[PDB]
Amino acid sequence: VKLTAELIEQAAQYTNAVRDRELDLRGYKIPVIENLGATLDQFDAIDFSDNEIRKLDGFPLLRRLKTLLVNNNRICRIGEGLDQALPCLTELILTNNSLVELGDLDPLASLKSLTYLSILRNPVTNKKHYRLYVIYKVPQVRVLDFQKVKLKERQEAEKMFK
Amino acid sequence: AHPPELKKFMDKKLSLKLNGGRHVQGILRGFDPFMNLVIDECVEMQNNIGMVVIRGNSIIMLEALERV
């Protein structure tokens, strides 16, 4: 069950609860993110929850995409050119995925508008200094794992890793 | 001499964009063929102004705050 324009064309389309245009891609067992061209850049965010995607990569240039819900997939790596295809990405929900090393979260530093980030229920979470590492390497984030990035944490992350 | 198709919006709360960058909110109580409106419990965007007449001439856009 490949991602398809045909798949995308019959997919529930609606205005969500936070007033944004959202496309429902949930629960199709998609393994690879591809063929997004067919959405025609018409959505604020895409719901990819409960699928089998391994890597957050493969996006076309999508200027309107601001929210990506990627819950319960198998994300173990993040693509390197994400800001070049998603310039205004502001919210990224990655709860319950497979990111294991702090260094695998490095590609998120290039998403200049990224403000809401959620990486809960990922092995990487239990790594020593996981929160400070994210704060220093992705300073554009204001809310991390539903907790406010505070000044004291920023300073503390400036010492360690300076 | 057509009517605007607004019966669907009758007695609903609405958000009205007017010319001059002016915005008000209130409940639709009626209309005529010129799209002049009667709006009840109207609020200038906030200060309460009560029941008012809006001339259709100066109506840019309306948005329902309810489900029709």
């Binding site: - | 109580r29 009626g30 009667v38 029941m51 809006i54």
Partner: protein, 79 residues
């Protein structure tokens, strides 16, 4: 359903003091008691006033006929 014209007819009968929002001019609004009006929403106002929202200043007019061209909005005031 209340028709807008009728609301006016009500304003007329009530002799409620009325405040008019003008078209493409925000800094000034007009006030008065509707004595009569016509098919074009042209209004005859009594003891009318120019209201400067910026200057908090009022200009006294007396007997006014305001063309309806200018009408954006019609409201009532307790004063």
């Amino acid at each position: 359903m209340v028709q807008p014209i009728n609301l006016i007819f009500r304003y007329l009968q009530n002799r409620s003091r009325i405040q008019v929002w003008l078209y493409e001019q925000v800094n000034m609004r007009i006030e008065g008691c509707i004595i009569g009006f016509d098919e074009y929403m042209n209004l005859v106002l009594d003891d009318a006033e120019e209201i400067h929202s910026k200057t908090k200043s009022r200009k006294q007019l007396g007997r006014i006929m305001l063309k309806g061209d200018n009408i954006t909005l019609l409201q009532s005031v307790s004063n």
